[PDB]
Design a protein around this ligand. Structure first.
Ligand code: HEM
Ligand code: HEM
Ligand SMILES: N=C(NCCC[C@H](N)C(=O)N[C@@H](CCN)C(N)=O)N[N+](=O)[O-]
Ligand SMILES: N=C(NCCC[C@H](N)C(=O)N[C@@H](CCN)C(N)=O)N[N+](=O)[O-]
Ligand SMILES: C[C@H](O)[C@H](O)[C@H]1CNc2nc(N)[nH]c(=O)c2N1
Ligand SMILES: C[C@H](O)[C@H](O)[C@H]1CNc2nc(N)[nH]c(=O)c2N1
Ligand SMILES: C[As](C)(=O)[O-]
Ligand SMILES: C[As](C)(=O)[O-]
Ligand SMILES: [Zn+2]
Lengths: 403, 404
């Protein structure tokens, strides 16, 4: 029943009893674990999810069982029985948003979960309106390099009607232009979305870091193209602290990470468009985006620049190159006074979070493969920490691409 | 589409379906409610079906499934288990089972070599002293003066009532761990307990940072006897860095032969409580875990100081910089001393090749992602981008309780 969770660096042991609160199934079975896979292969229902969430809400404000709680439960009941759905009060939406983040098994920056600026954009009715909301989110979230965690929530999904959607995976991304020989100019992960924009009328550029335009879609309407104001998108030029030649690579990366393709679920209500943003962990840029073989794959260039023996693996030219690249990122952002957290500082904070959560809820869902950084795994405390992964709600989930 | 786990490699975009998982006959630690994938430690009738299953596996491997020899061996096993409670494997069956266990090991990234394993049968062994002889022969052959050769020595199987054959040490070669007066540990903290058992058993302990421990071998129903390994047999590699001339002055060293010895080899229901196996190292086992783990030698800070790095702030990546040089030092000294070793880049690339081989051969390959991805430079190796299905196949290697 209750799993024994152990830390092999300290020898400490805990028991996760929070997992018993999981109402949704994961991909694993007793016959085989599929935990390393990235994606997941009625009034009665909604009403129970709803009641559960309203319960979670009143416990949070410690007025559980009070009159306000009973009344709110009747309100939800009344509305669903009559209309087959219901709506969240703004304070409830704020609570749910923070809970969804807190329960995100794959997020290592959850120690911040309680500090989330929630923008209610549920009174939105057009791509143009979505665009203004998104532009405000960015201005606020970016805050002159002193990033602030924020989420903007658009109109919930409705039976029969189409979903409100942001077609980009993130609010800010660089284009990927397929060229003559199947090669790619820019970010290879964004080839498809870069072409969808062009197909909808965007005048493509020809650089390695062309910030893409947003394709916003209001219910049952073809998406609309919007270009983000260059001054709204803060970027950081990457230069190395000692290798004067690094800058010559002209590498640069935007300061704001803001997933916009995930779905936010609360009390059974589904918000198909709810972009969120906190701040980068340096490895996301230095390791994954700049070094993945299917991304900017610059590992070799930096290696040759450092004059390394890229002739053999055992020379570890790749490992050496990666480290400087990550150092270059940390340095640059620090130099541009833009918020960023290295993977050591980040994982250290997660461990406290795991402790805070152990005492607060008796456990914490975590996905090991995602919590452990892409470089220097065992050198971080999370590597040595066993973790239990299960699905809690409020939750952020993946959803199909709208095309 | 196919009703089997879909597996994707996000670097190449390719897909496969694992159908091999259908063959697993033992539940794992997970359930639809929660994944415990990251946890390290998560009846004549029953023995009969396990054995029949194995025999079938054997005859399939030699392409004689359904034949008379097959149907006769099955008859033979039932007869034997029927009038004794257990049964015995044939030479060729043990060799096939030992290799399959290696082959089925979810946590081993070196499985591409599973085919080339030297199986030393030692089921005749009847004393602790003879256990020592067998082990010394293993080390001698496996070490092969630096050109390591995969091998496993199988001792007598667990018998009804009779005591198990057990090697008390975790590996045939391990360094001592001495608890100090002030609380710290001299040597390898991981082996503090076994070092204490070697002493409670008459061993005259040394006081170095790298003292090779003696072996505590145990024959059925007898207390363990203490055997000291002849130094000439235990090959060690002094570590030095290729350009940091001062690294050699740290006096760090590591043995060449990794030989797990506390694992139980299970074949067709038979349990081999003592069956030490050895291959060769992946540089990160030494350079990253053993030398840099906080609870091991913990030399990260020392090395960082020597490189004159700013250990006051995390964002300097002093830990990352040192770990890299240490790992390179392990690779450089092994290459220098002509001792077999493989870095995490070559190792993982060869494992990708293995996955591709097993896809065609068995329709899948059970793998533990957390154990396959190396402790450093994770996403720089191809396995990180490879999804993996994990399940228990038999024969297999299993953890077993400490004999004491
Ligand atoms: C305060 C700064 C934060 C940091 C440093 C942080 C860091 C991370 C990192 C490293 C990842 C993995 C990214 C990847 O490898 O693709 C992640 C995933 C995630 N984070 Fe956070 N996070 C932070 C804030 C937030 C906020 C504000 C939210 C939303 C309210 C959030 C929601 C999530 C979710 C949903 C995932 C998993 C997404 C997926 O499955 O792909 N994070 N976070
Ligand atoms: C040929 C060279 C080999 C290499 C490079 C190799 C490499 C590895 C590595 C890196 C690990 C993980 C070590 C750890 O983190 O504790 C491992 C685990 C394992 N290997 Fe291999 N291996 C090789 C040969 C063998 C052989 C000969 C066998 C058995 C016949 C074997 C059986 C296993 C098993 C069962 C595990 C997991 C044990 C556990 O759960 O602690 N390996 N191997
Ligand atoms: N630090 C954050 N990182 C989010 C990183 C998102 C990642 N770069 C990405 O592209 N994720 C894919 C999912 C990749 N499996 C997506 N569709 O958004 N988030 N934040 O709020 O501060
Ligand atoms: N390279 C190998 N490494 C074996 C790794 C052994 C590891 N150092 C260790 O101490 N393992 C624990 C098991 C930890 N789960 C043990 N009890 O032997 N194996 N080989 O045959 O080539
Ligand atoms: C196949 C494997 O699950 C996949 O590559 C995972 C591993 N760990 C990860 N960890 C983080 N933070 N982000 C990722 O995208 C991944 N990808
Ligand atoms: C808690 C976590 O399971 C533990 O630290 C695991 C992770 N991956 C590992 N991988 C290998 N090869 N060896 C190990 O000892 C571990 N330890
Ligand atoms: C900067 As190039 C060598
Ligand atoms: C270099 As040493 C102290
Ligand atoms: Zn699992």
């Amino acid at each position: 029943k209750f799993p024994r969770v152990k830390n092999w660096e300290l020898g400490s042991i805990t028991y996760d009893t929070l997992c018993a609160q999981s109402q949704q199934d994961g991909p694993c079975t007793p016959r085989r674990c599929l935990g390393s896979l990235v994606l997941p292969r009625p009034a009665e229902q909604l009403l129970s999810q709803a009641r559960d969430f309203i319960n979670q809400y009143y416990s949070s404000i410690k007025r559980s069982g009070s009159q306000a709680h009973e009344e709110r439960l009747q309100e939800v009941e009344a509305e669903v029985a009559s209309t087959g759905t219901y709506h969240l009060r703004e304070s409830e939406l704020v609570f749910g948003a923070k809970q969804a983040w807190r329960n995100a098994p794959r997020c290592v920056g959850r120690i911040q979960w309680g500090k989330l600026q929630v923008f209610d954009a549920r009174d939105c009715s057009s791509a143009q309106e979505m665009f203004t909301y998104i532009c405000n989110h960015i201005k606020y979230a970016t805050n002159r390099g002193n990033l602030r965690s924020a989420i903007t929530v658009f109109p919930q999904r409705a039976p029969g009607r189409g979903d409100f959607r942001i077609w980009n995976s993130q609010l800010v991304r660089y284009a990927g232009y397929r060229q003559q020989d199947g090669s790619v100019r820019g970010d290879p992960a964004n080839v498809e979305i870069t072409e969808l924009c062009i197909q909808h009328g965007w005048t493509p550029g020809n650089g390695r870091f062309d910030v893409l335009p947003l394709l916003l879609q209001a219910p049952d309407e073809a998406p609309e193209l919007f270009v983000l104001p260059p001054e709204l998108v803060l970027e950081v030029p990457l230069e190395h602290p000692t290798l004067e030649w690094f800058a010559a690579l002209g590498l640069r990366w935007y300061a704001l990470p803001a997933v916009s393709n995930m779905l936010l679920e609360i009390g059974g209500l589904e918000f198909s468009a709810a972009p969120f943003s906190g701040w980068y962990m340096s490895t996301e840029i230095g390791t994954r985006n700049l070094c993945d073989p299917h991304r900017y794959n610059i590992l070799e260039d930096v290696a040759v620049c450092m004059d390394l023996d890229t002739r053999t693996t055992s020379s570890l030219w790749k490992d050496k190159a990666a480290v400087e690249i990550n150092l270059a990122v940390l340095h640059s952002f620090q130099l541009a006074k833009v918020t960023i957290v290295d993977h050591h500082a980040a994982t250290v904070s997660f461990m406290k979070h795991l402790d805070n959560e152990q005492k607060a809820r008796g456990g914490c869902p975590a996905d090991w493969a995602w919590i452990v950084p892409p470089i220097s795994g065992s050198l971080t405390p999370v590597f040595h920490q066993e973790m239990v992964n299960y699905i809690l709600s409020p939750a952020f989930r993946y959803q199909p691409d709208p095309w």
